[PDB]
Write a protein that binds this ligand. Structure first.
Ligand SMILES: *[C@]1(O)O[C@H](CO)[C@@H](O[C@@]2(O)O[C@H](CO)[C@@H](O[C@]3(O)O[C@H](CO)[C@@H](O)[C@H](O)[C@@H]3O)[C@H](O)[C@H]2NC(C)=O)[C@H](O)[C@H]1NC(C)=O
Ligand SMILES: *[C@]1(O)O[C@H](CO)[C@@H](O[C@@]2(O)O[C@H](CO)[C@@H](O[C@]3(O)O[C@H](CO)[C@@H](O)[C@H](O)[C@@H]3O)[C@H](O)[C@H]2NC(C)=O)[C@H](O)[C@H]1NC(C)=O
Ligand SMILES: *[C@]1(O)O[C@H](CO[C@@H]2O[C@@H](C)[C@@H](O)[C@@H](O)[C@@H]2O)[C@@H](O[C@@H]2O[C@H](CO)[C@@H](O)[C@H](O)[C@H]2NC(C)=O)[C@H](O)[C@H]1NC(C)=O
Ligand SMILES: *[C@@]1(O)O[C@H](CO)[C@@H](O[C@@]2(O)O[C@H](CO)[C@@H](O)[C@H](O)[C@H]2NC(C)=O)[C@H](O)[C@H]1NC(C)=O
Ligand SMILES: *[C@]1(O)O[C@H](CO)[C@@H](O[C@@]2(O)O[C@H](CO)[C@@H](O)[C@H](O)[C@H]2NC(C)=O)[C@H](O)[C@H]1NC(C)=O
Lengths: 102, 260, 230, 207, 207, 230, 260, 102
């Protein structure tokens, strides 16, 4: 491969301490990847959550790219979540299961 | 305590769509203060900056836009300089900006470009300084390199609250049992602005810096960043592992322990 | 007949004076041009001086309290290199060039012109132009080698760099001839070239096209090799 | 200033040898240019490149981006039509007052002057010629071998003599003329000594 | 002598400069040897090889085992004390009409006149003194950089003047000396023009 | 004081006559050594000639049954190269060399000997040997630099093959000197070399040493150079 | 038909018993015709040779011996030039020979030596000529190079029976199936003379050069060579595979299928 | 430095298409080994057959060596034969079972 490619580093997390019951935001912060175009979507129990705004596409000193997604959801101790991320890579899209620990 | 301002220009190529794609995020000491792109006529500045009635500062807008126009020809020229088929998406990332601090009268300016992720040999030495100006000589001309010391100081007085702050770290550890017999000690740090923060686990006075788990210090999304560093520890030795959470928005070393 | 031409090989003008060096560009879109000027000393590389926006930005060379040289772009379709207050160290060869391409350089350069600094000794003493004096092929060669040689030995000048050149006059086509280095003559110079006459085409005259800053009139000398009867 | 270094300050080769010029700078560049200066002072571009390898004839310029700071130009089968002063040069992106992605000034190096001497193969004998006329005399020779040569002279009324001048004929041999201001208003003759063998221009003059 | 070609017939470098000398043979060679002979003295010896690549001081060179036909010699951080001619010579096993596995005959390349010129250096101002010997006045120009020089001895009844001597001084600067013979000897003062300035023997002689 | 070295450095002998070179050997293994002989022409490189076996069993060079030369190895622990039927293309530099005892090879050659074939002159009678001409330091220099330079000028010598080094004759060792290339005197040859003596060593006596074939008696020249204090 | 005589000199050293070990087998084509080493006063040539009361081989006797002899010095002057501990055994292989072919008056002189396993740079362009022509009579004929041809002649003439002969290859194919579903067909070639035999499996169509098991051609103690090549054939098809055998003896390239 | 050694190859077989009952010769062929010092013995149902002769040491293009040890044996359906070759290049003496086809 000649076009210097860089694959994204994904993290999914709550903006504040997750206390299922009340509102907060679902964040998926993709960064460290390069080739601009990136498809990042949210998920709920398996489907595609919507009406999600994203950040002002900027980069790091290493000319790497970073984007942040976030939504207005109501945390519950039974609604499994994960981030949907696919971009110029090898394997199939990448889904990141949200976890209490991080 | 050096403060700063940078603009990250980003432009892309689309396989024969005539007009390219692009943007221009701008920041100051880790806080976004400005913005611009195609199919946009103006610089939606930071809402948190309530400027007074008339926009007396747009010479930077002069700057950006032309950069928008010019953006094309560049991706154009860049494409022929290197043998590259106009059929493959291309991108040109550019970054200008500068630092600031009185004492030594600090004022260095960064101007760097990259083709498809490739530093572009600019002739001028890199981090160049800039604080002086001839006598009786207004330099109102097009350049941004001369409006740093000016435009930085401009952004830091129309929204001081969000740029003069220092939200310290709220840290706490957490125990999570390992079916393997070990226990992960996750030292969190939440709500802090000056992104540059460092957490660290020590074991009998010896930092375990290079042999612990660490996450790219991700963005709260509301105005600050979060970060947690962790370790695996013998079922028991817990109360022996400490978590030094440094940061200057905290006088002395914040130190944690936890377990249960 | 050109992509960049630079008349006047050399220019010699008295100490602490102003000098004129210009290259007639031949390229339209002459406005959206950027012309870089270059300096070459005795045995050094070639260094940069300035660039012109092909539209009298009048980019000038200022060096702390001093305006040193000027870049310009008139109607005579040329850019002129103006050099102020001449001192010896400023004595060197000058080139005008630009870059073929919006994003590049095939780098097109010119012949370049060497600036000559002259102190006192004369008030244009005499003319100071090449002094010809031709030499006839050797009956000895014709006879034994059926080959011939002829030349044009010059003298009495000051144009340090006078570059000689020949070509079959009829079908005037530059044809590499050969000459020897420049030798001094009590502060005067004089070169001597020659040729290897194509064995069978020795007619009456081919031409020894000389050329110098100070040469009778201001045109390349047209020199021929007539025949005899007396 | 100071940030470029050409390999040999000078170097000389035989017809059919193979050598290379190197020159490096560490201030990252966009491209390295290669030139040959004629005796006329004209600047002949040889190669052009911002990427790896290229080749044509015998000259080949090599520049590679592991740092984009060093470039080499080798020569194979070096032939007479190559000698000259070679230069390396580097250009770099020039950013306008506006944002026109242009090209900054070209940086050259010091001069590495190539000098390609001819193959050595079974010699031949030097045929002298006559060239003099009017208080002026200068001997001739067509295609001989070594720079080793002494153009003797035979004049009646003598004055000071001057330095010669040996070029390099087409065939591949040397040639030369030795200036001399004498008298003998139309009469002169030449004599040469090379390799212990002497040759009177007279030895060829017939009738 | 039809089987060894020495790469550079000539080569020159400033201190700090770098270079290589190639040398390949028209026949399998078993061991290679690289000599360096100064001005006109003995042949010093730098390397002996039969396979591989050795490196002494700054010099490095090699013979590539599997080929047995090519040798290379590099000079790094060149330095004035590396001037002189380099020679590469190799040999091969011989076999007598009686199977005596001998090996005597040593082939030599054509040699390479390596010349190290001084670092580019800010011009230097000479010092001029006058050596004497009734009828004999010698002009000594001292520690000056740019070689470009003009020395003249102001005398009236000048007998015979010899060309000037210009040797690379110790410190890497240039130096010169020039004799001649004169009548006004005692009067004779020497004037030196170098780098547009003028220096007089006189300028120093105290009085 | 030697591993293998040759006597004279230059040898000028008659056309069509015999010339034999010599090389003092210094290895006890002598009887069982092998002495090698190469020749060299003007910038060409050593060319092999013949080898001298362990002691006699002399070898030589016939040119189609007519010998050209012969290496020898006698009592005086040295070998000898003879040369009969002398001609110009036989004039060069002859060298001696030996290959390490038990088949080793850091090959050692000597200083070599230049073989000059001299033509004719009445009956060649003239004193052609070095001729000094000392020049002491210059007070100016002494005074201003606290240095002192000397001039060793030799002329009217023939071979044209001299070696001149400035030895601090109070103690045998060599001093970085400078020297002018040897210029041809109409029918002879001349030469000079200087020495720049530092301050704290100005007090010592230095001697410039000339070594040249046709030179009086048959020994190097002893040229002493005073050292004074005033 | 071309021809070639060869000598294989081979020498070894052990401790300092001084006495080096050596042999000098000398072949002609694939028939060894000469043996000679240490502990033999005379070069013991091959039995099957018309002998006619002639001590007229001396020239060959002379040569070999010496060669054997210098083996002392040779094998030694070769240790120091490499200064290899004379305590580790070493060997010196030498090979000379020539291939004649009068129909083209051709002759090639070979002469290669090798120390431990590496060839020795020699002045020779290994393959050279062995036919010299000048307009004279005297010479010193005692160089194995100048007789090799002649000797070859001798051998050939004095041996035309065994040497100038062609014993064709007798060939059969065997079917000895394997465990896992695919038969194994082995093509045989027995007692053929010149070792050069090329056997090949195929499908009427092409050859199976890339998927075969080939035994390097071995010798049988009677002056003949035998070779085999086999492959894995499906128990079904089992016959659309032919064995084309090529050799000097049989003109008509032999083709083999199984029994039926 | 490190010498370039080459292990021995081995081929054990019958001179003639063996048939137990009538005579034939047993042949253990070795080739391609470099250091010529080599040990080769045949075996009759397990032991080192009394006396076996071999050829005169010769080598090939790549100087590798080759020797063939042959003996007089009477193949007998229920009597196995094999080769014992020990070289400076191998772990333990290698045994080569003699099968009738290969
Ligand atoms: C030898 O002396 O060389 C000189 C210099 O080249 C020859 O001088 C002349 O005569 O060359 C030609 C031939 O006569 C002259 O050309 C003429 O005479 O020019 C004048 C114009 O001024 C005019 O009459 C015609 O145009 C002629 O062609 C030329 O003027 C001479 N050169 C000078 C300046 O003196 C000379 O002839 C030659 N000697 C011999 C014996 O060949
Ligand atoms: C300048 O004039 O050069 C001349 C000629 O080279 C120097 O002349 C003398 O003195 O040079 C040496 C040094 O004194 C003399 O050598 C001595 O004197 O020779 C005699 C034998 O005759 C003996 O006393 C010793 O062997 C000395 O070394 C030499 O004889 C002189 N030359 C002649 C022939 O006059 C002269 O010294 C020098 N001037 C100065 C001030 O240096
Ligand atoms: C120029 O000579 O380049 C070398 C750097 O080494 C070379 O470049 C790399 C990228 C490869 O091509 C590799 O093959 C070469 O090694 C500089 O030369 C010297 O390098 C020394 C170590 O190699 C180092 O010790 C010296 O400091 C350095 N300079 C000196 C003192 O000569 C050199 O700086 C480059 N330009 C030059 C010669 O001025
Ligand atoms: C050189 O060998 O010979 C010439 C010519 O004989 C010598 O020239 C001079 O100098 O000889 C004497 C001695 O000075 C003078 O009177 C003559 O005028 C000169 N001849 C001419 C006409 O030039 C020359 O001296 C000699 N060279 C050397 C170094 O001895
Ligand atoms: C001698 O010097 O050996 C070198 C190295 O093998 C040869 O170099 C070249 O020229 O060999 C081929 C033939 O031209 C080229 O393709 C190689 O690129 C080049 N080798 C290098 C890296 O320089 C010389 O040609 C050979 N000399 C002669 C006179 O044969």
């Amino acid at each position: 491969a000649d076009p210097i490619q860089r694959t994204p580093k994904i993290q999914v997390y709550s903006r504040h301490p997750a206390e299922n019951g009340k509102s907060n935001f679902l964040n998926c912060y993709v960064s460290g990847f390069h080739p601009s175009d990136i498809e990042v979507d949210l998920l709920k129990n398996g489907e595609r959550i919507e009406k999600v705004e994203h950040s002002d596409l900027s980069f790091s000193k290493d000319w790497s790219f970073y984007l942040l997604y976030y939504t207005e959801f109501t945390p519950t101790e039974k609604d499994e979540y994960a981030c949907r991320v696919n971009h110029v890579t090898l394997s199939q899209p990448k889904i990141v299961k949200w976890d209490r620990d991080m | 305590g050096s403060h700063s301002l940078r603009y990250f220009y980003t432009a892309v190529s689309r396989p024969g769509l005539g007009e390219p794609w692009f943007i221009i995020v701008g920041y100051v000491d880790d806080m976004q203060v400005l913005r611009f792109s195609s199919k946009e006529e103006t610089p939606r500045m930071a809402p948190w900056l309530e400027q007074e009635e008339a926009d007396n500062w747009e010479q930077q807008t002069r700057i950006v836009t032309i950069q928008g126009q010019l953006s094309e020809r560049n991706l154009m020229t860049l494409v022929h300089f290197y043998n590259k088929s106009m059929d493959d998406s291309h991108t040109l990332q550019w970054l200008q900006g500068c630092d600031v601090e009185p004492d030594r009268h600090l004022c260095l300016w960064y101007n760097q470009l990259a083709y498809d992720s490739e530093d572009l040999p600019t002739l001028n030495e890199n981090p160049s300084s800039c604080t002086v100006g001839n006598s009786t000589v207004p330099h109102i001309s097009q350049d941004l390199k001369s409006h740093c010391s000016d435009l930085l100081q401009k952004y830091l007085e129309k929204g001081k609250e969000r740029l003069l702050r220092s939200d310290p770290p709220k840290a706490h550890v957490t125990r999570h049992p390992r079916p393997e017999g070990d226990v992960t000690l996750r030292c969190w740090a939440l709500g802090f602005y000056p992104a540059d923060i460092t957490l660290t686990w020590q074991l009998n006075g010896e930092e375990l810096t290079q042999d612990m788990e660490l996450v790219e210090t991700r963005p709260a999304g509301d105005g600050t960043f979060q970060k947690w560093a962790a370790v695996v520890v013998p079922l028991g030795k817990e109360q022996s592992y400490t978590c030094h959470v440094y940061h200057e928005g905290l006088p002395e070393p914040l130190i944690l322990r936890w377990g249960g | 007949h050109g992509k960049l031409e630079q008349p006047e090989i050399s220019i010699s003008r008295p100490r602490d004076e102003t000098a004129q060096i210009s290259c007639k560009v031949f390229i339209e879109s002459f406005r959206s041009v950027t012309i870089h000027w270059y300096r070459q000393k005795p045995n050094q590389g070639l260094e940069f001086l300035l660039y012109v926006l092909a539209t009298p930005t009048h980019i000038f060379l200022d060096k702390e309290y001093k305006k040193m040289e000027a870049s310009k772009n008139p109607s005579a379709s040329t850019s002129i290199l103006t050099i102020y207050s001449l001192e010896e160290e400023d004595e060197a060869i000058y080139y005008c060039s630009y870059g073929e391409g919006s994003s590049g350089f095939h780098k097109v350069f010119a012949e370049g012109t060497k600036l000559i600094v002259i102190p006192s000794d004369k008030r244009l003493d005499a003319d100071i132009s090449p002094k010809p004096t031709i030499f006839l092929p050797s009956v000895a060669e014709t006879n034994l080698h059926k080959t011939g040689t002829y030349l044009c030995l010059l003298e009495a000048f000051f144009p340090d760099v006078i570059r000689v050149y020949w070509k079959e006059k009829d079908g005037n086509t530059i044809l590499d001839s050969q000459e020897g280095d420049t030798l001094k003559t009590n502060d005067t110079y004089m070169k001597f070239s020659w040729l290897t006459v194509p064995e069978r085409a020795m007619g009456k005259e081919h031409r020894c096209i000389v050329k110098h800053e100070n040469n009778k009139g201001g045109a390349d000398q047209a020199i021929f090799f007539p025949s005899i009867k007396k | 200033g100071d940030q470029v270094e050409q390999s040999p300050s000078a170097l000389s080769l035989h017809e059919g040898t193979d050598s290379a010029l190197r020159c490096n700078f560490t201030t990252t560049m966009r491209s390295v240019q290669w030139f040959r200066q004629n005796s006329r002072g004209s600047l002949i571009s040889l190669f052009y490149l911002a990427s790896g390898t290229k080749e044509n004839g015998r000259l080949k310029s090599a520049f590679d981006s592991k740092e984009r700071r060093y470039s080499t130009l080798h020569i194979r089968d070096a032939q007479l039509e190559d000698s000259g002063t070679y230069f390396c040069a580097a250009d770099t992106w020039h950013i306008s007052e506006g944002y026109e992605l242009g090209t900054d000034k070209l940086v050259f190096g010091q001069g590495t002057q190539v000098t390609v001497e001819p193959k050595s193969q079974p010699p031949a004998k030097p045929s002298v010629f006559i060239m003099k006329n009017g208080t002026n005399v200068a001997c001739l020779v067509k295609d001989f071998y070594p720079k080793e040569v002494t153009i003797s002279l035979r004049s009646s009324k003598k004055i000071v003599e001057f330095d010669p001048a040996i070029v390099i004929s087409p065939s591949g041999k040397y040639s030369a003329v030795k200036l001399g201001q004498y008298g003998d208003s139309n009469s002169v003759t030449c004599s040469v000594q090379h390799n212990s063998e002497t040759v009177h221009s007279t030895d060829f003059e017939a009738a």
